């Protein structure tokens, strides 16, 4: 119940033969997994972190210019040459300057003039890559136990370290069996297209090709104290004002320009371990060995009293918190739901089956009431605690919200949203294959399109669809216009 | 700026997005439109930086 209150949770409920259900973790939301006889637990991918990062390429952000040396030839003969030109550390440029008797040359006319300065770089920008060998995912799993201090408690949990070498690490929950994780960590944010821009103690996960296409001069990338820099011509600005001579000026410090050139990148915390916090992971949940505590306990026949007022969460759960008043401590809590004094039992306990483990140890229950009046009976007898509640909503509204949530998931996850909570099945396989093919084609088409250009192109294409009448309307409009507007209204995550 | 000069158009100067001030050579000037330098980053609707 470290999952309550996040506002991003989403409940997986299915189960199959061998009781395996694959769910997807996104660093933002915490999954909840309910089952018929398995204790409902919750999962959250805490932090993805890498280690032993190599440096692929180094970029200069600002420079200093010293030792400006110049040389000119007599006009109409030869071309100005300078021994310092061949040096890798020196930036040079050739220009033509008028010369005459005033300048000492014999014959009037334009003559070449080369100026060579010393480009000693400063404030490098390292660009680091990570191999899949060292990437590590940490996963936290908690079963709904009804402990006193376990409402959205970020700390207490069970951690399982997942690495590509050994990706089938199974958690060992106390008194609940062993939840088995068999996940593929190769999929996810493809780290073969990630270069970390460690630039003055701020990292970023940019695309590889975009990093290679940064105009700033690039170094060899090896570990040296005086690396040679290629493409130095664009961070020093030679200025030939009029035609008498030319000066040499260093451009400046490119940090502010870099920060606005990274306006779409995702930030990652870089201090010590480069613990990335954005990303997603697909994992299978093998719940065969997993059991629930105290299925055989007797029922409670005593008084129950609320110790904290019931307050509905964002998704409809109400978080009942009660304390036992009887003398039989190792006992099971009863439950009942009536809509309009009718035992329709149209409710559900997101907790598996809450049980009191001590006489006066408070226990908290997460129940899902129906959409109307819902009288909830906890104890038995005339002393049964009665929690009146009223969930304000409609069933169709919940379906619309679920559809919107699924659409957002399909927009963020490429096609793994088709596997999120996909309990086996053959229909989901065909859906995933179709979506994979069409999404690959669609992203190959709309590679690197603006937040507003997507909306504009979508409007234009849906208008084209509404115009054409050769049954191109039906596919053009539906397949491109609506999809592209929906995407372009979401892309800026 | 930084021992350099340029002859820019007045309106273009007045248009560029940087935090300006009265330029009265007094101490502790108050800058307008400070939001052009600071960038607040709410990560997971958990906290702000």
């Amino acid at each position, epitope marked *: 119940m470290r999952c309550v209150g996040v506002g991003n949770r989403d409940f997986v409920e299915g189960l199959s033969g061998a009781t395996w259900v694959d769910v997807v973790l996104e660093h933002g939301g915490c999954v909840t997994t309910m089952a018929k006889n398995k204790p409902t637990l919750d999962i959250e991918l805490q932090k993805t972190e890498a280690t032993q990062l190599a440096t692929l390429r180094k970029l200069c952000i600002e420079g*200093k210019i010293t030792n400006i040396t110049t040389d000119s030839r007599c006009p109409t003969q030869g071309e100005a040459v300078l021994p310092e030109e061949q040096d890798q550390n020196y930036v040079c440029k050739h220009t033509y300057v008028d010369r005459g008797w005033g300048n000492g040359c014999g014959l009037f006319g334009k003559g070449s003039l080369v100026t060579c300065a010393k480009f000693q770089c*400063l*404030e490098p920008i390292e660009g680091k890559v990570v191999q899949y060998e060292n990437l590590k995912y940490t996963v936290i799993i908690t079963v709904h136990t009804g402990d006193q201090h376990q409402v959205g408690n970020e700390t207490q949990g069970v951690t399982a370290e997942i690495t590509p070498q050994a990706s089938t690490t199974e958690a060992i929950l106390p008194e609940y069996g062993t939840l088995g994780l068999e996940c593929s960590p190769r999929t996810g944010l493809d780290f073969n297209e990630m270069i970390l821009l460690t630039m*003055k*103690n701020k990292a970023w996960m940019v695309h590889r090709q975009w990093f290679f296409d940064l105009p700033l001069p690039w170094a060899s990338g090896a*570990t040296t*104290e005086t690396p040679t820099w290629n493409r130095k011509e664009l961070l020093v600005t030679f200025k030939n004002a009029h035609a008498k001579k030319q000066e040499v000026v260093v451009l400046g410090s490119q940090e502010g320009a870099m920060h606005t050139a990274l306006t779409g990148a995702t930030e990652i915390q870089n*201090s*010590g371990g480069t613990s990335i916090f954005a990303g997603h992971l697909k994992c299978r949940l093998k719940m065969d060995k997993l059991e629930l505590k105290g299925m055989s306990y007797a029922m409670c026949t005593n008084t129950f009293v609320l110790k904290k007022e019931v307050s509905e969460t964002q998704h409809g759960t109400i978080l009942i918190k009660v304390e036992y008043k009887g003398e039989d401590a190792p006992c099971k809590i009863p439950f009942s739901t009536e809509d309009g004094q009718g035992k329709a039992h149209n409710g559900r306990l997101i907790t598996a089956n809450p049980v009191v483990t001590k006489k006066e140890e408070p226990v908290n229950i997460e129940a899902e009431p129906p959409f109307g009046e819902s009288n909830i009976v906890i104890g038995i007898g005339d002393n049964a605690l009665k929690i009146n509640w009223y969930k304000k909503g409609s069933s169709i509204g919940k379906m619309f919200e679920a559809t919107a949530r699924g659409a957002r998931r399909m927009a963020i996850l490429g096609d793994t949203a088709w596997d999120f909570g996909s309990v086996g099945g053959v229909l989901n396989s065909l859906g995933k294959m179709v979506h994979q093919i069409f999404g690959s084609a669609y992203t190959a088409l709309f590679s690197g399109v603006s937040w507003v250009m997507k909306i504009g192109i979508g409007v234009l294409l849906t208008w084209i669809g509404l115009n054409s009448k050769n049954t191109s309307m039906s596919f053009s409009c539906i397949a491109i216009g609506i999809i592209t507007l929906y995407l372009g209204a979401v892309v800026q995550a | 700026m930084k021992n350099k000069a340029w002859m820019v158009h007045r309106q273009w100067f007045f248009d560029l997005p940087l935090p300006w001030a009265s330029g009265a050579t007094t*101490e*502790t000037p108050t800058w307008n439109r400070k939001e052009l330098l600071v960038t607040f980053k709410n990560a997971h609707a958990k906290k702000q930086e």
Partner: antibody, heavy 122, light 113 residues
């Protein structure tokens, strides 16, 4: 590229006051808090006094509190330290530290001056 | 008046070897409002003026070699050097910037063994 050069350091007998001056260059001075730090020979670095961006606000180390005075001539781009009632203990190499260029602390050191030596002895 | 105690007082290490310097505080230097930890590490090279290596607990300063990295959360901070060169001779004075009367440590010394 910033250059902080010391001035005013010389010999002085105990009890005779002295005024130190820190000349600054390479940055806009009026926006930077400045510090005075000293290192007695063979002793750890010991911060002396700080003046913030606004001229009025100043603070001094308790070991030297009430004996020194720190002033800012930002129009001339220089810092002033006034040493009064000097003690033979108060002999050290004195430094001039700028405010941090990047960070969160209102007062920090990023660039240290070349250093001047003041000797208080008889 | 937080007093800074450093664990090592002399560190003689051969070149191409790691090194660990410890600067232990008398109080947690973690500013509550921002959650940062203001501990600085300077190096005064012999016959030179002090530099600034790591301007936080672990975020190194500009112009510093690749090997200098720090750590520590509340009171036990470290300065890790990966491969010692011949230029690392100096005095690694740590410092706390949490409180106004900021005080340096005694400062360790590094020499080539």
């Amino acid at each position: 590229q910033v250059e902080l050069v010391e001035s005013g350091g010389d010999v002085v007998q105990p009890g005779k006051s002295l005024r130190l001056s820190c000349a600054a260059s390479g940055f806009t001075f009026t926006n930077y808090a400045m510090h005075w730090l000293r290192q007695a020979p063979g002793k750890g670095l010991e911060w002396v006094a700080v003046i913030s961006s606004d001229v009025n606000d100043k603070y001094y180390a308790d070991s030297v509190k009430g004996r020194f005075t720190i002033s800012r001539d930002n129009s001339k781009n220089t810092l002033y330290l006034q040493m009064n009632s000097l003690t033979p203990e108060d002999t050290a190499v004195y430094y001039c530290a700028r405010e941090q260029a990047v960070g969160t602390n209102p007062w920090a050191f990023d660039y240290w001056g070349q250093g001047t030596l003041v000797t208080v002895s008889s | 008046h937080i007093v800074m105690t450093q664990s090592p007082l002399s560190l003689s290490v051969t070149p191409g070897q790691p090194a660990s310097i410890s600067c232990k505080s008398s109080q947690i230097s973690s500013w509550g409002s921002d959650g940062k930890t203001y501990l600085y590490w300077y190096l005064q090279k012999p016959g030179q003026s002090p530099q600034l290596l790591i301007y936080e607990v672990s975020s190194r300063f500009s112009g510093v070699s690749d090997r200098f990295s720090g750590s520590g959360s509340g009171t036990d901070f470290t300065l890790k050097i990966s491969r010692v060169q011949a230029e690392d001779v100096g005095l690694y004075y740590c410092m706390q910037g949490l409180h106004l009367p900021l005080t340096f440590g005694q400062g360790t010394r590094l020499e080539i063994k």
